[PDB]
Design an enzyme around this catalytic site. Structure first.
Site, PDB file in Angstrom:
ATOM      1  N   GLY A  10      -7.944   5.044  -0.350  1.00 56.47           N
ATOM      2  CA  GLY A  10      -7.330   3.895  -0.799  1.00 56.47           C
ATOM      3  C   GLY A  10      -6.053   3.626  -0.130  1.00 56.47           C
ATOM      4  CG  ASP A 118      -0.214  -2.851  -4.752  1.00 54.12           C
ATOM      5  OD1 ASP A 118       0.834  -2.356  -5.347  1.00 54.12           O
ATOM      6  OD2 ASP A 118      -0.794  -1.744  -4.000  1.00 54.12           O
ATOM      7  CG  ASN A 256      -3.898   7.830  -1.573  1.00 55.30           C
ATOM      8  OD1 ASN A 256      -4.804   7.985  -0.479  1.00 55.30           O
ATOM      9  ND2 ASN A 256      -3.533   6.438  -1.491  1.00 55.30           N
TER      10      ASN A 256
END
Length: 468
Positions: A10, A118, A256
Protein backbone atom coordinates in the site's frame (compact mmCIF):
# COMPACT_ATOMS: atom_id res chain seq x y z
CA UNK A 1 -7.53 -19.31 17.39
CA UNK A 2 -6.59 -17.59 14.14
CA UNK A 3 -4.24 -14.63 13.85
CA UNK A 4 -3.17 -12.44 10.95
CA UNK A 5 0.47 -11.75 10.15
CA UNK A 6 1.63 -10.37 6.85
CA UNK A 7 2.44 -7.58 4.46
CA UNK A 8 0.40 -4.82 2.83
CA UNK A 9 1.35 -3.51 -0.63
CA UNK A 10 0.00 0.00 0.00
CA UNK A 11 2.88 2.36 -0.71
CA UNK A 12 3.08 5.07 -3.34
CA UNK A 13 5.47 4.53 -6.23
CA UNK A 14 6.07 2.10 -9.04
CA UNK A 15 4.16 -1.08 -8.10
CA UNK A 16 5.85 -4.43 -7.78
CA UNK A 17 5.76 -6.97 -10.60
CA UNK A 18 4.65 -10.60 -10.76
CA UNK A 19 8.11 -12.12 -10.27
CA UNK A 20 8.75 -9.99 -7.19
CA UNK A 21 5.39 -10.96 -5.71
CA UNK A 22 6.01 -14.67 -6.32
CA UNK A 23 9.40 -14.45 -4.62
CA UNK A 24 7.69 -12.57 -1.79
CA UNK A 25 5.23 -15.44 -1.41
CA UNK A 26 8.07 -17.95 -1.27
CA UNK A 27 9.80 -15.91 1.43
CA UNK A 28 6.57 -15.49 3.41
CA UNK A 29 6.03 -19.24 3.45
CA UNK A 30 9.65 -19.75 4.51
CA UNK A 31 9.10 -17.29 7.38
CA UNK A 32 5.72 -18.72 8.47
CA UNK A 33 3.61 -15.70 7.59
CA UNK A 34 0.07 -15.99 6.28
CA UNK A 35 -1.33 -12.68 4.98
CA UNK A 36 -0.82 -10.54 1.90
CA UNK A 37 -3.02 -7.49 1.35
CA UNK A 38 -3.19 -6.02 -2.16
CA UNK A 39 -4.08 -2.33 -2.10
CA UNK A 40 -1.37 -0.53 -4.10
CA UNK A 41 -1.89 3.22 -4.06
CA UNK A 42 -0.94 3.75 -7.71
CA UNK A 43 -3.09 0.98 -9.23
CA UNK A 44 -5.64 2.86 -11.32
CA UNK A 45 -8.19 0.04 -11.03
CA UNK A 46 -7.74 -0.12 -7.24
CA UNK A 47 -8.40 3.44 -6.06
CA UNK A 48 -8.57 6.09 -8.78
CA UNK A 49 -10.72 4.23 -11.35
CA UNK A 50 -12.31 1.53 -9.21
CA UNK A 51 -15.50 1.56 -11.30
CA UNK A 52 -13.75 -0.01 -14.29
CA UNK A 53 -13.62 -3.75 -14.98
CA UNK A 54 -10.46 -5.75 -15.54
CA UNK A 55 -9.36 -6.85 -18.99
CA UNK A 56 -8.45 -10.34 -20.16
CA UNK A 57 -4.70 -9.81 -19.77
CA UNK A 58 -5.08 -8.17 -16.36
CA UNK A 59 -7.39 -11.08 -15.56
CA UNK A 60 -4.62 -13.53 -16.44
CA UNK A 61 -2.17 -11.62 -14.25
CA UNK A 62 -4.58 -11.65 -11.31
CA UNK A 63 -5.48 -15.32 -11.78
CA UNK A 64 -1.81 -16.32 -11.94
CA UNK A 65 -1.03 -14.35 -8.79
CA UNK A 66 -4.02 -15.78 -6.89
CA UNK A 67 -3.20 -19.34 -7.95
CA UNK A 68 0.42 -18.87 -6.89
CA UNK A 69 -0.82 -17.61 -3.53
CA UNK A 70 -3.05 -20.68 -3.17
CA UNK A 71 -0.06 -22.90 -3.94
CA UNK A 72 1.86 -21.54 -0.94
CA UNK A 73 -1.23 -21.34 1.33
CA UNK A 74 -0.85 -17.59 1.86
CA UNK A 75 -4.11 -15.74 2.33
CA UNK A 76 -4.67 -13.10 -0.35
CA UNK A 77 -6.86 -10.07 0.40
CA UNK A 78 -7.98 -7.72 -2.38
CA UNK A 79 -8.81 -4.16 -1.34
CA UNK A 80 -10.88 -1.42 -2.96
CA UNK A 81 -10.77 2.28 -2.06
CA UNK A 82 -13.84 3.90 -3.65
CA UNK A 83 -13.84 6.76 -1.14
CA UNK A 84 -12.49 9.23 -3.70
CA UNK A 85 -15.75 9.78 -5.58
CA UNK A 86 -18.39 7.20 -4.61
CA UNK A 87 -21.97 8.36 -4.05
CA UNK A 88 -23.67 6.38 -1.30
CA UNK A 89 -27.30 7.18 -2.12
CA UNK A 90 -27.07 6.03 -5.75
CA UNK A 91 -27.98 2.34 -6.24
CA UNK A 92 -25.85 2.29 -9.39
CA UNK A 93 -22.72 2.88 -7.32
CA UNK A 94 -23.56 -0.03 -5.02
CA UNK A 95 -24.33 -2.27 -8.00
CA UNK A 96 -21.05 -1.30 -9.66
CA UNK A 97 -19.12 -2.13 -6.50
CA UNK A 98 -20.92 -5.47 -6.24
CA UNK A 99 -20.12 -6.28 -9.87
CA UNK A 100 -16.46 -5.34 -9.42
CA UNK A 101 -16.17 -7.57 -6.36
CA UNK A 102 -17.92 -10.39 -8.23
CA UNK A 103 -15.40 -10.04 -11.05
CA UNK A 104 -12.65 -10.30 -8.44
CA UNK A 105 -14.26 -13.38 -6.87
CA UNK A 106 -14.69 -15.06 -10.26
CA UNK A 107 -10.88 -15.27 -10.46
CA UNK A 108 -10.84 -17.29 -7.24
CA UNK A 109 -10.05 -14.53 -4.75
CA UNK A 110 -11.38 -15.22 -1.25
CA UNK A 111 -10.92 -12.18 1.00
CA UNK A 112 -11.93 -8.60 0.32
CA UNK A 113 -11.35 -5.25 1.99
CA UNK A 114 -12.78 -1.74 1.74
CA UNK A 115 -10.64 1.29 2.53
CA UNK A 116 -11.70 4.90 3.13
CA UNK A 117 -8.29 6.24 4.13
CA UNK A 118 -6.97 9.62 2.98
CA UNK A 119 -10.25 11.09 1.73
CA UNK A 120 -12.37 14.12 2.61
CA UNK A 121 -14.81 14.33 5.53
CA UNK A 122 -17.66 15.78 3.44
CA UNK A 123 -20.58 14.26 1.57
CA UNK A 124 -22.61 15.31 -1.44
CA UNK A 125 -25.95 17.03 -0.98
CA UNK A 126 -27.76 13.84 -2.02
CA UNK A 127 -26.16 11.81 0.77
CA UNK A 128 -27.04 14.54 3.27
CA UNK A 129 -30.73 13.77 2.70
CA UNK A 130 -30.24 10.08 3.57
CA UNK A 131 -27.49 9.63 6.17
CA UNK A 132 -27.15 11.59 9.40
CA UNK A 133 -23.36 11.25 9.35
CA UNK A 134 -20.37 10.44 7.16
CA UNK A 135 -19.68 7.39 9.33
CA UNK A 136 -23.30 6.30 8.90
CA UNK A 137 -22.96 6.19 5.12
CA UNK A 138 -19.61 4.39 5.25
CA UNK A 139 -20.88 1.75 7.68
CA UNK A 140 -24.12 1.23 5.76
CA UNK A 141 -22.36 0.64 2.44
CA UNK A 142 -19.76 -1.63 4.06
CA UNK A 143 -22.48 -3.70 5.75
CA UNK A 144 -24.41 -4.02 2.48
CA UNK A 145 -21.27 -5.18 0.67
CA UNK A 146 -20.46 -7.67 3.43
CA UNK A 147 -23.96 -9.14 3.32
CA UNK A 148 -23.84 -9.40 -0.48
CA UNK A 149 -20.44 -11.12 -0.52
CA UNK A 150 -21.77 -14.05 1.53
CA UNK A 151 -20.11 -13.21 4.87
CA UNK A 152 -16.54 -14.39 4.20
CA UNK A 153 -14.32 -15.39 7.09
CA UNK A 154 -11.93 -12.47 6.50
CA UNK A 155 -12.99 -8.89 5.84
CA UNK A 156 -11.09 -5.67 6.56
CA UNK A 157 -12.38 -2.11 6.91
CA UNK A 158 -10.24 1.01 7.31
CA UNK A 159 -11.94 3.95 9.04
CA UNK A 160 -11.19 7.39 7.63
CA UNK A 161 -9.82 8.24 11.09
CA UNK A 162 -7.20 5.50 10.99
CA UNK A 163 -4.97 7.17 13.60
CA UNK A 164 -5.34 9.15 16.79
CA UNK A 165 -4.00 12.35 15.23
CA UNK A 166 -7.00 12.26 12.86
CA UNK A 167 -9.53 11.74 15.66
CA UNK A 168 -11.26 14.80 17.06
CA UNK A 169 -11.15 15.80 19.83
CA UNK A 170 -9.72 12.44 20.96
CA UNK A 171 -10.05 8.71 20.38
CA UNK A 172 -12.53 8.06 23.18
CA UNK A 173 -14.94 10.93 22.45
CA UNK A 174 -14.88 10.90 18.64
CA UNK A 175 -18.46 10.62 17.33
CA UNK A 176 -17.14 9.00 14.15
CA UNK A 177 -15.61 6.03 15.97
CA UNK A 178 -18.57 5.65 18.32
CA UNK A 179 -20.99 5.51 15.39
CA UNK A 180 -18.72 3.04 13.60
CA UNK A 181 -18.55 0.77 16.63
CA UNK A 182 -22.30 0.94 17.20
CA UNK A 183 -23.38 0.33 13.61
CA UNK A 184 -20.64 -1.87 12.12
CA UNK A 185 -21.51 -5.54 11.80
CA UNK A 186 -19.63 -7.85 14.20
CA UNK A 187 -18.12 -9.89 11.37
CA UNK A 188 -15.79 -7.16 10.09
CA UNK A 189 -12.26 -6.50 11.32
CA UNK A 190 -11.06 -2.89 11.65
CA UNK A 191 -7.66 -1.47 10.69
CA UNK A 192 -5.74 0.88 12.98
CA UNK A 193 -2.27 2.43 12.92
CA UNK A 194 -1.69 3.69 16.48
CA UNK A 195 -1.33 7.16 18.01
CA UNK A 196 0.24 8.65 14.87
CA UNK A 197 0.42 7.93 11.16
CA UNK A 198 3.99 6.71 11.72
CA UNK A 199 3.88 5.57 15.33
CA UNK A 200 7.26 5.50 17.05
CA UNK A 201 5.88 3.30 19.83
CA UNK A 202 2.55 1.71 20.70
CA UNK A 203 1.66 1.66 24.42
CA UNK A 204 -0.93 -0.95 25.37
CA UNK A 205 -3.18 1.66 26.99
CA UNK A 206 -3.88 3.36 23.65
CA UNK A 207 -4.86 0.02 22.12
CA UNK A 208 -7.19 -0.60 25.06
CA UNK A 209 -8.68 2.87 24.61
CA UNK A 210 -9.41 2.07 20.96
CA UNK A 211 -10.84 -1.32 21.94
CA UNK A 212 -13.19 0.36 24.42
CA UNK A 213 -14.80 2.11 21.43
CA UNK A 214 -14.63 -0.31 18.50
CA UNK A 215 -15.87 -3.20 20.70
CA UNK A 216 -13.41 -5.57 19.01
CA UNK A 217 -9.73 -6.16 18.69
CA UNK A 218 -8.14 -4.10 15.89
CA UNK A 219 -5.75 -5.13 13.13
CA UNK A 220 -2.48 -3.19 13.20
CA UNK A 221 -1.44 -1.40 9.99
CA UNK A 222 2.18 -0.67 10.89
CA UNK A 223 4.05 1.95 8.86
CA UNK A 224 7.23 1.46 10.91
CA UNK A 225 9.10 0.83 7.64
CA UNK A 226 7.00 2.93 5.26
CA UNK A 227 9.05 5.35 3.16
CA UNK A 228 6.44 7.12 1.02
CA UNK A 229 6.20 10.24 3.20
CA UNK A 230 9.83 11.14 2.42
CA UNK A 231 11.32 8.94 -0.29
CA UNK A 232 14.92 10.01 0.38
CA UNK A 233 14.92 7.70 3.41
CA UNK A 234 15.60 3.96 3.36
CA UNK A 235 14.86 1.80 6.40
CA UNK A 236 16.72 -1.46 7.02
CA UNK A 237 16.57 -1.66 10.82
CA UNK A 238 14.78 -4.37 12.74
CA UNK A 239 11.18 -4.26 13.89
CA UNK A 240 11.42 -2.36 17.16
CA UNK A 241 9.33 -0.53 19.72
CA UNK A 242 6.14 -2.62 19.67
CA UNK A 243 5.49 -4.65 22.81
CA UNK A 244 4.68 -8.33 22.45
CA UNK A 245 1.98 -8.16 25.13
CA UNK A 246 -0.29 -6.72 22.43
CA UNK A 247 -0.35 -10.08 20.63
CA UNK A 248 -3.25 -11.59 22.65
CA UNK A 249 -5.13 -8.28 22.27
CA UNK A 250 -4.77 -7.97 18.48
CA UNK A 251 -6.41 -9.70 15.53
CA UNK A 252 -3.30 -9.32 13.37
CA UNK A 253 -0.21 -7.38 12.33
CA UNK A 254 0.32 -6.17 8.76
CA UNK A 255 3.44 -4.27 7.74
CA UNK A 256 3.98 -1.62 5.09
CA UNK A 257 7.31 -2.44 3.41
CA UNK A 258 9.74 -0.10 1.69
CA UNK A 259 8.91 0.87 -1.88
CA UNK A 260 12.02 -0.98 -3.08
CA UNK A 261 11.20 -4.68 -3.17
CA UNK A 262 14.60 -6.12 -2.24
CA UNK A 263 15.12 -3.81 0.76
CA UNK A 264 12.42 -5.48 2.89
CA UNK A 265 14.14 -8.77 3.71
CA UNK A 266 15.23 -7.65 7.18
CA UNK A 267 11.96 -5.99 8.18
CA UNK A 268 9.81 -8.97 7.21
CA UNK A 269 12.16 -11.48 8.85
CA UNK A 270 12.18 -9.46 12.07
CA UNK A 271 8.39 -9.21 12.00
CA UNK A 272 8.13 -12.98 11.59
CA UNK A 273 10.44 -13.52 14.56
CA UNK A 274 8.53 -10.97 16.63
CA UNK A 275 5.23 -12.74 16.02
CA UNK A 276 6.61 -16.27 16.40
CA UNK A 277 8.25 -15.45 19.73
CA UNK A 278 5.01 -15.33 21.74
CA UNK A 279 2.33 -17.38 19.98
CA UNK A 280 11.99 -10.70 21.97
CA UNK A 281 15.23 -8.76 21.46
CA UNK A 282 15.43 -6.27 18.56
CA UNK A 283 19.23 -6.52 18.49
CA UNK A 284 19.22 -10.33 18.38
CA UNK A 285 16.43 -10.29 15.79
CA UNK A 286 18.45 -7.94 13.58
CA UNK A 287 21.56 -10.09 13.97
CA UNK A 288 19.69 -13.26 12.98
CA UNK A 289 18.03 -11.47 10.06
CA UNK A 290 21.36 -10.26 8.68
CA UNK A 291 22.94 -13.68 9.21
CA UNK A 292 20.19 -15.25 7.12
CA UNK A 293 20.25 -12.41 4.58
CA UNK A 294 23.97 -12.74 3.84
CA UNK A 295 23.33 -16.13 2.20
CA UNK A 296 21.46 -14.57 -0.74
CA UNK A 297 24.37 -12.36 -1.80
CA UNK A 298 26.20 -15.49 -2.97
CA UNK A 299 29.82 -14.79 -3.87
CA UNK A 300 31.37 -11.95 -5.87
CA UNK A 301 31.91 -12.67 -9.54
CA UNK A 302 35.42 -14.00 -10.14
CA UNK A 303 37.36 -14.90 -13.27
CA UNK A 304 36.44 -18.50 -14.09
CA UNK A 305 39.16 -20.98 -15.01
CA UNK A 306 36.62 -23.84 -14.82
CA UNK A 307 44.91 -22.61 -20.43
CA UNK A 308 44.85 -19.55 -18.15
CA UNK A 309 47.44 -16.87 -17.47
CA UNK A 310 49.05 -16.83 -14.02
CA UNK A 311 51.26 -13.82 -13.18
CA UNK A 312 54.78 -13.93 -11.82
CA UNK A 313 56.59 -11.80 -9.24
CA UNK A 314 57.11 -8.88 -11.66
CA UNK A 315 53.60 -8.86 -13.18
CA UNK A 316 50.56 -6.90 -12.09
CA UNK A 317 48.14 -8.96 -9.97
CA UNK A 318 44.88 -10.13 -11.50
CA UNK A 319 41.81 -8.20 -10.41
CA UNK A 320 40.20 -9.84 -7.38
CA UNK A 321 37.03 -9.00 -5.47
CA UNK A 322 36.55 -9.43 -1.74
CA UNK A 323 33.44 -11.23 -0.48
CA UNK A 324 30.66 -9.34 1.27
CA UNK A 325 31.01 -9.64 5.04
CA UNK A 326 28.61 -9.51 7.97
CA UNK A 327 30.24 -6.30 9.17
CA UNK A 328 29.44 -4.59 5.87
CA UNK A 329 25.77 -5.54 6.21
CA UNK A 330 25.66 -4.36 9.83
CA UNK A 331 27.19 -1.03 8.84
CA UNK A 332 24.71 -0.69 5.98
CA UNK A 333 21.85 -1.36 8.40
CA UNK A 334 23.14 1.24 10.84
CA UNK A 335 23.42 3.79 8.03
CA UNK A 336 19.70 3.31 7.21
CA UNK A 337 18.11 2.30 10.50
CA UNK A 338 14.74 3.75 11.55
CA UNK A 339 12.41 6.70 10.87
CA UNK A 340 13.07 8.25 14.29
CA UNK A 341 16.64 7.21 15.10
CA UNK A 342 19.93 6.09 13.57
CA UNK A 343 21.99 3.03 14.31
CA UNK A 344 24.63 3.11 17.02
CA UNK A 345 27.47 3.35 14.51
CA UNK A 346 25.95 6.09 12.35
CA UNK A 347 24.96 8.15 15.38
CA UNK A 348 28.42 7.70 16.89
CA UNK A 349 30.07 8.79 13.63
CA UNK A 350 27.84 11.87 13.50
CA UNK A 351 28.63 12.79 17.11
CA UNK A 352 32.37 12.30 16.57
CA UNK A 353 32.32 14.42 13.43
CA UNK A 354 30.40 17.16 15.25
CA UNK A 355 32.96 17.12 18.07
CA UNK A 356 35.86 17.28 15.61
CA UNK A 357 34.22 20.20 13.81
CA UNK A 358 33.57 21.99 17.10
CA UNK A 359 37.21 22.00 18.26
CA UNK A 360 38.89 22.44 14.87
CA UNK A 361 40.11 25.95 15.70
CA UNK A 362 41.82 24.69 18.86
CA UNK A 363 44.88 23.36 17.02
CA UNK A 364 44.19 24.00 13.33
CA UNK A 365 46.51 26.94 12.65
CA UNK A 366 49.87 27.72 14.28
CA UNK A 367 49.18 25.53 17.31
CA UNK A 368 52.83 25.07 18.31
CA UNK A 369 53.22 26.02 21.96
CA UNK A 370 49.67 24.91 22.83
CA UNK A 371 48.47 21.89 24.80
CA UNK A 372 50.00 18.76 23.27
CA UNK A 373 47.36 16.50 24.82
CA UNK A 374 44.63 18.36 22.93
CA UNK A 375 46.59 18.07 19.68
CA UNK A 376 47.13 14.34 20.09
CA UNK A 377 43.53 13.67 21.12
CA UNK A 378 42.15 15.63 18.17
CA UNK A 379 44.49 13.88 15.73
CA UNK A 380 43.63 10.43 17.09
CA UNK A 381 39.89 11.05 16.93
CA UNK A 382 40.31 12.36 13.39
CA UNK A 383 42.21 9.19 12.47
CA UNK A 384 39.44 7.01 13.88
CA UNK A 385 36.89 9.00 11.88
CA UNK A 386 39.03 8.46 8.78
CA UNK A 387 38.99 4.72 9.47
CA UNK A 388 35.19 4.77 9.74
CA UNK A 389 34.89 6.63 6.43
CA UNK A 390 37.24 4.13 4.79
CA UNK A 391 35.11 1.31 6.15
CA UNK A 392 32.03 2.85 4.55
CA UNK A 393 33.76 3.30 1.19
CA UNK A 394 35.09 -0.26 1.31
CA UNK A 395 31.60 -1.52 2.10
CA UNK A 396 30.25 0.17 -1.01
CA UNK A 397 33.16 -1.09 -3.12
CA UNK A 398 32.70 -4.69 -1.99
CA UNK A 399 28.93 -4.55 -2.46
CA UNK A 400 29.51 -3.34 -6.02
CA UNK A 401 31.12 -6.68 -6.98
CA UNK A 402 28.29 -9.00 -5.89
CA UNK A 403 27.28 -11.48 -8.59
CA UNK A 404 23.59 -11.12 -7.67
CA UNK A 405 23.34 -7.42 -8.48
CA UNK A 406 19.55 -7.38 -8.11
CA UNK A 407 19.89 -6.64 -4.39
CA UNK A 408 22.19 -3.67 -4.98
CA UNK A 409 20.48 -2.21 -8.06
CA UNK A 410 17.19 -1.78 -6.19
CA UNK A 411 18.91 0.36 -3.53
CA UNK A 412 21.88 1.67 -5.52
CA UNK A 413 21.09 5.37 -5.15
CA UNK A 414 20.98 5.51 -1.34
CA UNK A 415 24.22 3.60 -0.73
CA UNK A 416 26.02 5.52 -3.46
CA UNK A 417 24.89 8.86 -2.03
CA UNK A 418 25.94 7.94 1.50
CA UNK A 419 29.38 6.79 0.37
CA UNK A 420 29.85 9.96 -1.69
CA UNK A 421 28.95 12.14 1.28
CA UNK A 422 31.28 10.12 3.52
CA UNK A 423 34.10 10.70 1.03
CA UNK A 424 33.38 14.44 1.03
CA UNK A 425 33.42 14.54 4.83
CA UNK A 426 36.71 12.62 4.89
CA UNK A 427 38.23 15.19 2.54
CA UNK A 428 36.95 17.98 4.79
CA UNK A 429 38.46 16.35 7.88
CA UNK A 430 41.81 15.94 6.12
CA UNK A 431 41.80 19.60 5.10
CA UNK A 432 41.06 20.54 8.70
CA UNK A 433 43.94 18.37 9.85
CA UNK A 434 46.40 19.98 7.42
CA UNK A 435 45.69 23.63 8.34
CA UNK A 436 48.84 24.18 10.42
CA UNK A 437 51.17 23.76 7.43
CA UNK A 438 48.74 24.22 4.51
CA UNK A 439 46.69 27.41 4.22
CA UNK A 440 44.73 26.25 1.16
CA UNK A 441 40.95 26.48 1.17
CA UNK A 442 39.03 23.24 1.58
CA UNK A 443 38.64 21.92 -1.95
CA UNK A 444 37.87 18.66 -3.71
CA UNK A 445 39.94 18.93 -6.84
CA UNK A 446 40.09 22.64 -7.63
CA UNK A 447 36.54 23.54 -6.57
CA UNK A 448 33.73 22.90 -4.07
CA UNK A 449 31.39 20.14 -5.33
CA UNK A 450 29.56 20.21 -1.98
CA UNK A 451 28.37 23.79 -2.51
CA UNK A 452 25.89 22.55 -5.11
CA UNK A 453 24.91 19.74 -2.72
CA UNK A 454 21.62 18.20 -3.92
CA UNK A 455 20.74 21.07 -6.24
CA UNK A 456 17.49 22.82 -5.39
CA UNK A 457 16.51 20.24 -2.77
CA UNK A 458 19.78 20.74 -0.89
CA UNK A 459 19.72 24.52 -1.18
CA UNK A 460 16.18 24.61 0.23
CA UNK A 461 17.17 22.18 2.99
CA UNK A 462 20.03 24.49 4.00
CA UNK A 463 17.53 27.19 5.01
CA UNK A 464 15.32 25.09 7.28
CA UNK A 465 15.32 25.81 11.03
CA UNK A 466 17.60 23.84 13.35
CA UNK A 467 17.75 23.29 17.10
CA UNK A 468 21.17 24.95 17.38
Amino acid sequence: RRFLCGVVEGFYGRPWVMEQRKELFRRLQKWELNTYLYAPKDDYKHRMFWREMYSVEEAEQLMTLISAAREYEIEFIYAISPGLDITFSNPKEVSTLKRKLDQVSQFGCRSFALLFDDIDHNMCAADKEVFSSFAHAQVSITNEIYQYLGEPETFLFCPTEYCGTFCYPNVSQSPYLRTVGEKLLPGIEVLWTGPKVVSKEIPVESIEEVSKIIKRAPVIWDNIHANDYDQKRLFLGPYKGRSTELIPRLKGVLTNPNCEFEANYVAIHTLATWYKSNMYSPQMALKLALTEWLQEFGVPHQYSSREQFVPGPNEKPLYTAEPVTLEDLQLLADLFYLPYEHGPKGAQMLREFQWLRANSSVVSVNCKGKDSEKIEEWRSRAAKFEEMCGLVMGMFTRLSNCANRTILYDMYSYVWDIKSIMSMVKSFVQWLGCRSHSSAQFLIGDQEPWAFRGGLAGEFQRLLPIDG
